[PDB]
Amino acid sequence: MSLCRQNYHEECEAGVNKQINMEFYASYVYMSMASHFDRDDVALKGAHEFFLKSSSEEREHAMRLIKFQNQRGGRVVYQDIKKPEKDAWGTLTDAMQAALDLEKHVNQALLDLHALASKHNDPQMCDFIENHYLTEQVEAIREISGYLTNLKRCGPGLGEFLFDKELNS
Amino acid sequence: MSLCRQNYHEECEAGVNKQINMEFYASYVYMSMASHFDRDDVALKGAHEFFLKSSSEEREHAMRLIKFQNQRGGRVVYQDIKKPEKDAWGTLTDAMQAALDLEKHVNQALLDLHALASKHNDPQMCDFIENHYLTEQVEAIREISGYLTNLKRCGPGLGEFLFDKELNS
Amino acid sequence: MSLCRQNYHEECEAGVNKQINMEFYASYVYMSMASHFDRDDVALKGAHEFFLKSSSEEREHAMRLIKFQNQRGGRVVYQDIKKPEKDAWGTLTDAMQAALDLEKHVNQALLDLHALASKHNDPQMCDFIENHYLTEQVEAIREISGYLTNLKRCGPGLGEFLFDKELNS
Amino acid sequence: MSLCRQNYHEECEAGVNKQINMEFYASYVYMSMASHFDRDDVALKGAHEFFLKSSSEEREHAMRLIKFQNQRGGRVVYQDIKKPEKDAWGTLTDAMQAALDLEKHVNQALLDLHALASKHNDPQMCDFIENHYLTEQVEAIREISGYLTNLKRCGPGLGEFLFDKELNS
Amino acid sequence: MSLCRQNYHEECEAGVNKQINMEFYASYVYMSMASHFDRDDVALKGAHEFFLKSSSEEREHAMRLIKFQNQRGGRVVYQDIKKPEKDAWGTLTDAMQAALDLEKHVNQALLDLHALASKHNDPQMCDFIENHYLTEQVEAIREISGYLTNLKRCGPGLGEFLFDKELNS
Amino acid sequence: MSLCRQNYHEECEAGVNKQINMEFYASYVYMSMASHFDRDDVALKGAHEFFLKSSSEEREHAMRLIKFQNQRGGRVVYQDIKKPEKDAWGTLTDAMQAALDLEKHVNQALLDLHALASKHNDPQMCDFIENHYLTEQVEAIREISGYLTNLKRCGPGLGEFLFDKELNS
Ligand SMILES: [Cu+2]
Ligand SMILES: [Cu+2]
Ligand SMILES: [Cu+2]
Ligand SMILES: [Cu+2]
Ligand SMILES: [Cu+2]
Ligand SMILES: [Cu+2]
Ligand SMILES: [Cu+2]
Ligand SMILES: [Cu+2]
Ligand SMILES: [Cu+2]
Ligand SMILES: [Cu+2]
Ligand SMILES: [Cu+2]
Ligand SMILES: [Cu+2]
Ligand SMILES: [Cu+2]
Ligand SMILES: [Cu+2]
Ligand SMILES: [Fe+3]
Ligand SMILES: [Fe+3]
Ligand SMILES: [Fe+3]
Ligand SMILES: [Fe+3]
Ligand SMILES: [Fe+3]
Ligand SMILES: [Fe+3]
Ligand SMILES: [Fe+3]
Ligand SMILES: [Fe+3]
Ligand SMILES: [Fe+3]
Ligand SMILES: [Fe+3]
Ligand SMILES: [Fe+3]
Ligand SMILES: [Fe+3]
Incomplete structure (x- = not known):
């Protein structure tokens, strides 16, 4: 018949639907970090922009998975996007740690x-993942890890x- | 003291947090409509792009509210973003009707x-809302209503x- | 000695020679589809160009495999290119279905x-295949599948x- | 009625279908010569490019005949494209000789x-042939003949x- | 905690440290080949430039591995870079053979x-290797193999x- | 006869071969410093770039000596490039001190x-050395000495x- 599906297993489809949810979740977390550093009583512009950019990137990560689902002839199925664990994320060091944990997850x-x-x-799916996600995660995790190291070096107050x-900024 | 809050009532703050959730929800609905019209067995590119654009706009609507919360010295509080009512949205007419209902909501x-x-x-808040939201809703609702009228005029199959x-497209 | 072959198994070499034949075959099929839609009594220019382009692409697919054979130190061995199954390919819907089947094969x-x-x-060979072929097939199959869906939506005559x-066009 | 055929004899149509097969065959021969001079143990880049170009030209020769068939209101009918006589074509002199023979055929x-x-x-068909093929063959044959003469002059090894x-190159 | 390491096995880390040493070694070999063809009594400029370029490329190969070690949260550990096997590399044919052997190693x-x-x-590491190294080796080996074939064809003296x-040059 | 050597003493030739080894060694040291400041748990980008540049410069220093050997009609002879004294170089102050010591050596x-x-x-050799090396060392040593002074002034943590x-950076 006329569908495009070929060599695409139901467990893989279901995994992509889960990863779609996880990317949107990460986008939501970064959104909350951004709004936290844009509080008048926190007021760290760099972190605000940095987490807003990260939230937009994670959204793109989700959308590319959504596209891949449809390209492979799967069926996208959405689930709730759960609110993040905290309403307030602490200092820039605390938020970076949390971001490191999120990225590693x-x-x-x-x-x-x-x-x-x-x-x-499914070698096409594996390739897709390697090409668009895995090196990108590696870079992002390394990047945030260096931020933690430098925040600890700079110390609180002026350093922050x-x-x-x-x-x- | 040193906070920026002035003339900003707790009920208003709470209302903005609710509207933030509603805008993200609308963004999520449009996301699902987009992925629905990008199925190999639906394959309507125009609708796909149109709902993807709408989803991105609703996201911006949310983010501007988030910013306004912080500008006024409120505290953004996130809630879950509930999955949309359907997994499959029907014909382009069915989806436009649903979109009309969503926008009206x-x-x-x-x-x-x-x-x-x-x-x-709070006249600043009222102004904010009128300036960035209300005429925009009016235009969007009118726009989708004309789409419904023309989809009915065009009829199913080739017209669609x-x-x-x-x-x- | 002085040859370049390394880590390249005879079964792989033979597989590339088979894939070279299959790509040329697909190029030949698309050629025949093109000439079919350029008949005075069929006269569908878009399909003509679309299948002529597809035939040229498949030729490139073959040539890149031929190059890869030589790069790896294999020996290209040609076989006959069999004529396509039909001399006349039907409506644009019939031809798209046949093209979908060919691509899936x-x-x-x-x-x-x-x-x-x-x-x-042979991880270099696997990479080669993923990099130049597999996502390309996925896109092509999805693309033709959407064409089938829209041809069925448009219906025969004017829609076609x-x-x-x-x-x- | 509504077909375009006029003054186009069935023997001519059948002759064009045969010439279409012969042009594709010549394209295939040149393809094999190209892959032969791109072997790590042959490694003559100029010949590789020259026969790859020749293979692409012969393909165009075929396609123009295919078009002419349809323009005249004939019906293109494809046959198998037979594999070339050899898998290995010898020195550049040996391949040029074979190419001369092919072109003369x-x-x-x-x-x-x-x-x-x-x-x-059918004076339109005669004109077509003279305009697009005959002087082109004459030039190609003369060209390859001069190559043979110079390859013999240059001699084997360094000259080649x-x-x-x-x-x- | 705050390090970036994830899914990166100690045997892999140690393998990257070994490959770092091997790339620097290859850079050193090519360096010596370059200086050999820049002797007043050898004086082959093309080979000089070609091996100097190759030495610089191998250095880049090493540095990209070094970067990858750090990106993955490994620890780069250097070892001695052993002198090449010969002080004098023979004719251009002798050096190309040695270069072929080195690349294959x-x-x-x-x-x-x-x-x-x-x-x-570790699929990210595999991808890294395929993306930056394996096709590059394949091209380099094939390239040098064609050089050997042509050096043998050209013969000694003037041909060289x-x-x-x-x-x- | 036909060699270029003139007024070039064997002790000088041997000295250039030793200096070639020493420049490569210094290049290797700086390489290790660079990779040390690119650790996720050190993460000082400026130092990373600065030592990577220094490593590339020292490589050029070596290569210019290699060229000079051949220009004078000497014979370049390579030795092992010994691994640097440490695997970890401490704070930016510790590494600068070590770099000062290396340059002075x-x-x-x-x-x-x-x-x-x-x-x-050998006045040509003396000139060569003065022209390309000695003022360059003087500048580099002075430069690193000012860095030490300022690192001590800035102090640890934020200053670093x-x-x-x-x-x-
Ligand atoms: Cu699968
Ligand atoms: Cu794999
Ligand atoms: Cu890739
Ligand atoms: Cu208020
Ligand atoms: Cu206004
Ligand atoms: Cu293999
Ligand atoms: Cu792979
Ligand atoms: Cu006729
Ligand atoms: Cu005539
Ligand atoms: Cu004429
Ligand atoms: Cu690992
Ligand atoms: Cu891959
Ligand atoms: Cu001297
Ligand atoms: Cu002087
Ligand atoms: Fe992501
Ligand atoms: Fe990320
Ligand atoms: Fe909105
Ligand atoms: Fe809207
Ligand atoms: Fe293909
Ligand atoms: Fe294709
Ligand atoms: Fe021809
Ligand atoms: Fe020709
Ligand atoms: Fe290398
Ligand atoms: Fe290489
Ligand atoms: Fe130096
Ligand atoms: Fe220096």
């Missing part, structure tokens, strides 16, 4: 999704202000 | 939020294909 | 060729004419 | 096809390398 | 490093001089 | 090499971060 899920596609012998400018 | 909520800000004598091109 | 062969290269632990313009 | 077939169109009083650069 | 080590990363289920110009 | 060796060329009455930006 997203990366584990992509590694699991990749493990799924190879188990099912000056470090915040270097994000991009 | 969003507009009623903004009108209620406006009613709240005038009740509390040709109409879909005129959205922008 | 080519994709299965590439997936088998990939399975061969991983079985033999109008749809044919949208291919590119 | 193609030219005899075009001269026969022309003899057919004049016998049937240097001559190969002059093709275009 | 480097390629086997990368294939082993890749085998290591898949064994440990003329061939040397074609490298780039 | 390289400078003493060049001063000895110069003493050698004047002892042997801010100073690191001024290197170039």
